[PDB]
Amino acid sequence: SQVFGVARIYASFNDTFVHVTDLSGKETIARVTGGMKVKADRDESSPYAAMLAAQDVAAKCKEVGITAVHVKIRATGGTRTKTPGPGGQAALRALARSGLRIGRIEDVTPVPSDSTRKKGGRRGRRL
Amino acid sequence: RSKPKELPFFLQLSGEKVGDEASVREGIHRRDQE
Amino acid sequence: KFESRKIMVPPHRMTPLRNSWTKIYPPLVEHLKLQVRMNLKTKSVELRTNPKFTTDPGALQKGADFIKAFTLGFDLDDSIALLRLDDLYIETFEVKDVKTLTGDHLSRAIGRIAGKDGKTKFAIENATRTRIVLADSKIHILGGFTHIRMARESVVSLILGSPPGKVYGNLRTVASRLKER
Amino acid sequence: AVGGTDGSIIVVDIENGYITHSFKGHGGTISSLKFYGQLNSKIWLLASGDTNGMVKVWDLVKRKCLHTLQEHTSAVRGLDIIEVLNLLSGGRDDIINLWDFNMKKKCKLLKTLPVNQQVESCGFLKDGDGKRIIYTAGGDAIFQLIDSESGSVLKRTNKPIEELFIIGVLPILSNSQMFLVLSDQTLQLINVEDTIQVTSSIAGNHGIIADMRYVGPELN
Amino acid sequence: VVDPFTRKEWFDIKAPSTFENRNVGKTLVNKSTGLKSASDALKGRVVEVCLADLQGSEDHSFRKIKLRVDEVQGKNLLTNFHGMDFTTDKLRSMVRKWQTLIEANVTVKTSDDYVLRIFAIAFTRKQANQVKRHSYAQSSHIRAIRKVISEILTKEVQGSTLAQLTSKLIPEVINKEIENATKDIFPLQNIHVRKVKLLKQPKFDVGALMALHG
RNA sequence: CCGUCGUAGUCUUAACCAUAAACUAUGCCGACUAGGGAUCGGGUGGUGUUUUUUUAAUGACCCACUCGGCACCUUACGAGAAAU
RNA sequence: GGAACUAAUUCCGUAGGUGAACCUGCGGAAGGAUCAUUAAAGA
């Protein structure tokens, strides 16, 4: 029915990436993030910003020749947090209600058959 | 001086009211009562 | 002009949700106007949006989030709150994320979050207006962003092996400085 | 006439805010539309160009789509209806295609012009009499006047060192004045009669100023 | 002062002949210019489409396919097989607690000498009357299962030219012959191919690629 | 009450050192004294179940028993300052 | 400087240290306060 592209949302903490590409991936179409739509460092991840970046992305998305899109949501991953950032579901919620018909969305956070020593040491990191 | 003295299915909340401080920072019923 | 979102249902949380099902699907289909099918054989909930009966495009996305919230082992009332308030989000992390713990060390760690008779776990939610789920190695949080960030720091302070008292201190500190504002 | 992103095109009267008629049209984005009219006439023709090489000459009085010309292999960026009837359609790919138009079914391709530039826009200039030179705007920004009888270019107004493309050309035509909107965000006025000479250059906007330094004796 | 979208030319991607729907998706390139062209860029791209979008039927929600572009002909670029994956969400649900997981794999050749490594996973199921919840096989069990799976997989790969394996995987006959030779060792549930990758393809041969397309 | 850079080190070979709350904070071998349900390994018994093919043979499962394990439960006709 | 005018948690082993009222890395111990849910091959 529509013209399909790929949404692909990387939502870590301290920032959230939204950017749509051609269904193959090789050629992209507009990006914009949460760090872009506010200036305060501390407020780089928050849903409020992602919503704004969802808004910008939706504009250019339909500005070229895309009408619909499948999303591939994703946390940091690797030897890092493994859990979805705040402004990723909020970045998808603001992208869902924008006309761009969605379809089939899986998680793609890189998960290892574990290893490479995590950072932090025996004491560990964030507190 | 003699007279006597005397919701919606979808809730509506402002960005500042909820946990969206960043949205409020860039943010920009009397008739119904009448 | 349809839309189809399909969410898998966990077997452990499958029985309570199916039992309350009769309390579960009516607020969706009736209050939000939506199609809620349920495949028992595939254990998958299917949320479809009808253009004629759906006023808001976002409601279909909201319905999927509500099903997931209950999926994560949260209460039906907590799931209902997600539809009612937008500002409510869920955060999930692995104990192995914050501090690599083996065997009993992990076990005890979990207890420090729960506490005797849930007392340690209940205090954090009340002072942070949130809902927490203590699964296996996964912990889930449900509530406002500003509320969740304070709650995550308190939970992490516990998982780092800090004593419960200290965490009570930080807890009433934060709850005071936020309920004040 | 308005062309939607979806490709559905609706015609709205300028004077009154109502839609005289709505056309479902071809299932593609609409690149451009061209209206044909006489101060007083019983015949009005509207031409719509899709993203793909399809041209539909919708007839307003008839309320029918007369003709389909998928000679083009790419979206038709510019459409010019030549005076009686031949239809000239700018081709995004590189092919600029002549056509024969009629109220009746008969229609045919009179000629095809191969030009080494993208046809951003094209038009028919009365100047030069019987040998009308089609006005062509390209991605390279080299304006081209091309014989009708032969494919050779009588004169090219410029090649510009700056790597810019003219988005579209607004031409008075009766006054023989052509306005070219350049990809460096400047407007050039070119008169229509080997290299076209711009009468004057008007710059709409300066994107960034590296530095401000005064020059010249007058200092204006 | 340029705009990338107003320069590229839209292209059409067509799936292999042995599929429910030939049409797949559209892509952006860059005008076939003298010195660097649109012809070169299109040839090396691949596309991941869930075969349920590619077969329609949903009893196929998981299982993703790699389609690689090899040849092109004016607004019409064809594709062939490049691999198969599962979906991450489906795989996570399958790994239930208190049950043995079993995987096995082999690198093996076909007729039209593509070389591939195919995968296979299965889990010990509970006997429908069993009091004990764990239902774990016995390593000796596991060893035997993998050797038979390995046996069956090598038989299918050598027999299949390349496209035939494709025709073999879609109705999952492999999945069942496994269960069949297996049920004499130990129960088992799920049992899927799970993932197949390509690592050595022969040589272009423009003739063979055209035969697959209809 | 941390953040950054980061030497040794972290890994491996050949050789050293030669001790830890090296902890069940409880020598070794054997023998007697009391109940219960789970589980790991082995074996025996069954016109048990399930797998179909043409019944089997297999296999996985169920019941009873028996050696030897890792543990838990309840208690005493026992012990202890008491937890046990 | 002069002189007018107006305004008014504990611990162990080990190693190192120059913001060392002692701390820090690696590995251990507890002699440190378990709430809640739990048949979903429920073919």
Curated annotation (Swiss-Prot), chain A:
Instruction: Tell me a GO biological process for this protein.
Output: ribosomal small subunit assembly
PANTHER family cross-referenced by the UniProt entry = 40S RIBOSOMAL PROTEIN S14/30S RIBOSOMAL PROTEIN S11 (PTHR11759)
Location in the cell reads: Cytoplasm; Nucleus, Nucleolus
Identify the keywords attached in UniProt to this record, alphabetized.
Acetylation, Cytoplasm, Nucleus, Ribonucleoprotein, Ribosomal protein, Ribosome biogenesis, rRNA processing
Superkingdom to which the source organism belongs? Eukaryota
Q: Does the keyword Cytoplasm apply?
A: yes
Give the gene symbol.
Answer: RPS14A
Q: What is this protein called?
A: Small ribosomal subunit protein uS11A
Assembly and partners are described as: Component of the small ribosomal subunit (SSU). Mature yeast ribosomes consist of a small (40S) and a large (60S) subunit. The 40S small subunit contains 1 molecule of ribosomal RNA (18S rRNA) and 33 different proteins (encoded by 57 genes). The large 60S subunit contains 3 rRNA molecules (25S, 5.8S and 5S rRNA) and 46 different proteins (encoded by 81 genes). uS11 interacts with eS1 forming part of the mRNA exit tunnel. uS11 interacts with snoRNA U3. uS11 interacts with MPP10. Component of the ribosomal small subunit (SSU) processome composed of at least 40 protein subunits and snoRNA U3.
Swiss-Prot record, chain B:
Domain notes from UniProt: The WD repeats are grouped into two tandem seven-bladed beta-propeller regions.
State the remark under miscellaneous.
Answer: Present with 2020 molecules/cell in log phase SD medium.
- Which purpose does this protein serve, as stated in its record? Involved in nucleolar processing of pre-18S ribosomal RNA and ribosome assembly.
The name on file for this protein is: U3 small nucleolar RNA-associated protein 21
In the UniProt record, the gene name given for this protein reads UTP21
How it assembles, according to the record, is: Interacts with snoRNA U3. Interacts with MPP10. Interacts (via WD repeats) with UTP18. Component of the ribosomal small subunit (SSU) processome composed of at least 40 protein subunits and snoRNA U3.
Q: Which domain of life is it from?
A: Eukaryota
Q: Which residues carry this modification: Phosphoserine?
A: S23
Intracellular or extracellular location(s): Nucleus, Nucleolus
UniProtKB/Swiss-Prot annotation, chain C:
Q: Any idea where this protein resides?
A: Cytoplasm; Nucleus, Nucleolus
Q: Which residues form a coiled coil?
A: none
What coarse category fits the chief subcellular location reported for this protein? cytoplasm
| Record keywords | Cytoplasm, Nucleus, Phosphoprotein, Ribosome biogenesis, RNA-binding
Note whether RNA-binding occurs among the keywords. Answer: yes
Recorded GO cellular component terms are: 90S preribosome; cytoplasm; nucleolus; nucleus
Give every KH domain span: 103-155
Q: Name one GO molecular function term.
A: unfolded protein binding
Q: Name one GO biological process term.
A: ribosomal small subunit export from nucleus
Q: Which family does it belong to?
A: Belongs to the PNO1 family.
Main function:
Required for small ribosomal subunit (SSU) synthesis. Has a role in the processing of early nucleolar and late cytoplasmic pre-RNA species. Recruits DIM1 to nucleolar pre-RNAs. Indirectly required for cleavage at the A2 site of the 20S pre-rRNA, forming 18S rRNA, and at A1 and A2 sites of other pre-rRNAs.
Under the subunit heading, UniProt states: Component of the small ribosomal subunit, ribosomal RNA processing complex (SSU RRP complex). Interacts with NOB1.
Q: What is this protein called?
A: Pre-rRNA-processing protein PNO1
Full-sequence range covered: 93 to 273 of 274
From Swiss-Prot, chain D:
Q: What is this protein called?
A: U3 small nucleolar RNA-associated protein 13
In the record, what terms sit under GO molecular function?
U3 snoRNA binding
Gene Ontology cellular-component terms listed? 90S preribosome; nucleolus; nucleoplasm; Pwp2p-containing subcomplex of 90S preribosome; small-subunit processome
Q: What are the subcellular locations of this protein?
A: Nucleus, Nucleolus
GO aspect biological process, one term:
endonucleolytic cleavage in ITS1 to separate SSU-rRNA from 5.8S rRNA and LSU-rRNA from tricistronic rRNA transcript (SSU-rRNA, 5.8S rRNA, LSU-rRNA)
Start and end residues of the WD repeats are: 25-70, 74-109, 114-156
**Is this entry keyworded Cell membrane?**
no
Protein's job: Involved in nucleolar processing of pre-18S ribosomal RNA.
Q: What other facts are recorded?
A: Present with 8070 molecules/cell in log phase SD medium.
Q: Which domain of life is it from?
A: Eukaryota
Alphabetically sorted, this entry's keywords are: Nucleus, Repeat, Ribonucleoprotein, Ribosome biogenesis, rRNA processing, WD repeat
Q: How does it assemble?
A: Interacts with snoRNA U3. Interacts with MPP10. Component of the ribosomal small subunit (SSU) processome composed of at least 40 protein subunits and snoRNA U3.
Keyword Repeat present in the record's keywords: the answer is: yes
